[PDB]
Amino acid sequence: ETSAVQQKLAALEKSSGGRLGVALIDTADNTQVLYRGDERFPMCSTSKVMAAAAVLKQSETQKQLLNQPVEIKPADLVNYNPIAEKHVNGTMTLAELSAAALQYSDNTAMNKLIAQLGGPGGVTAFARAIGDETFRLDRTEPTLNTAIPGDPRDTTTPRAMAQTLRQLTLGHALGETQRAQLVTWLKGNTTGAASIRAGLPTSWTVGDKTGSGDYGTTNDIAVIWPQGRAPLVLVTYFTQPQQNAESRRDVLASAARIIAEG
Length: 262
Ligand SMILES: *[B]([O])([O])[C]([C][C]([C])[C])[N]C(=O)[C][N]C(=O)C1=[C]C(Cl)=[C][C]=C1Cl
Ligand SMILES: [Cl-]
Known about the structure:
The protein is an alpha+beta fold.
């Protein structure tokens, strides 16, 4: 059966023409509210969180790792390189690459993080090490965004991603300095104003990471601090039937508004 929350989410899904996945964790009582919570969705750029977190984990035993310069060559540039293009024939540190990937969704920066982990499988291995049995990263940017219906590549479920995002930011999957750094990065994201943030009260602090891809795939994952109550974690994934469907960040904002009502 379904609650009124899930009925509202289903009606939003129906009106939108696509497939919506939602997972909310309320850390006050560890309850979850799910909509298609165990179905797989293409993560697209929301996978940048796991890649950055994996490098943070590496830095727990190599304290200066984040400050290590990494060469940016002309040939490294892919389809969206707002920060990395400023450093061609130059360098960016792993911290700078992490900030660029998370806060600007720079795809060259993401590919450097993936390479630092030994390839997409290294990101997946980190996920398994922190108890995420669902996440899989198969490809680099930009092909991880093909988002073909039914394809398990580069997917996770809303429930799994919400649980992991909680572990990474409010829990202790990462060390102290590292989890605080991840929170700082997520809070300063520049690309999320029309997504989850647009559906929540303005007094709430939010850290988030968006993503987008083919099939009009439009995603956001967030850690949320309401004023005067325990924080929440929210995942909103959305994908559509036709390859060239338009982005629908408004659907994510609407899903967040629905979840926040209660
Ligand atoms: B992320 O969602 O992975 C990222 C964020 C944007 C802001 C750069 N998305 C993409 O790169 C989307 N890319 C595609 O849909 C794409 C691009 C290219 Cl060049 C080739 C294949 C695909 Cl699927
Ligand atoms: Cl994005």
